[PDB]
Amino acid sequence: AFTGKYEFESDENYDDFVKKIGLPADKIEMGRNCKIVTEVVQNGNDFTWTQHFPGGRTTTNSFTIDKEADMETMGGRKFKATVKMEGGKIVADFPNYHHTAEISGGKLVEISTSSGVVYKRTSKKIA
Ligand SMILES: C[C@H](CCC(=O)NCC(=O)O)[C@H]1CC[C@H]2[C@@H]3[C@H](O)C[C@@H]4C[C@H](O)CC[C@]4(C)[C@H]3CC[C@]12C
């Protein structure tokens, strides 16, 4: 049940993650505790990851499972990566960064490991 809109519900190791990745304070407090909306559309194996920022810049990155996708972050990073699925879980491969998206009881939880820190973000499914 990836298709749908997701809104910030909970998170774990936020500060730890940002402190490790070396995220600037200006962006950290800017992108924290904010209602990020992730709109997902089911297109075969191509899942659209749309990140909406309240009163700020938006980011939209679509990816096809087992296909290289063009991605961009909110910090202004242009890059590409390959995304695959492991048992209904969307996993992306990155250098010292591991992102996995899955559904836990009707909730979307993205796990991002970086430099040892495991960042989790639970988003509820709404329409
Ligand atoms: C919200 C800010 C961008 C704020 C912004 O640019 N506002 C308008 C402006 O000042 O131009 C973005 C930039 C870096 C983004 C973070 C980085 O991408 C790291 C990490 C990425 C995860 O997908 C979401 C959480 C997390 C931690 C992001 C939260 C949102 C951040 C902090």
Ligand SMILES: C[C@H](CCC(=O)NCC(=O)O)[C@H]1CC[C@H]2[C@@H]3[C@H](O)C[C@@H]4C[C@H](O)CC[C@]4(C)[C@H]3CC[C@]12C
């Ligand atoms: C790993 C980067 C964040 C790297 C970082 O440190 N950013 C800080 C900054 O914004 O400067 C995040 C931001 C965009 C995220 C990708 C986009 O959300 C698109 C896609 C979403 C899927 O749920 C997971 C794979 C995939 C491809 C995500 C993997 C993790 C990415 C690529």
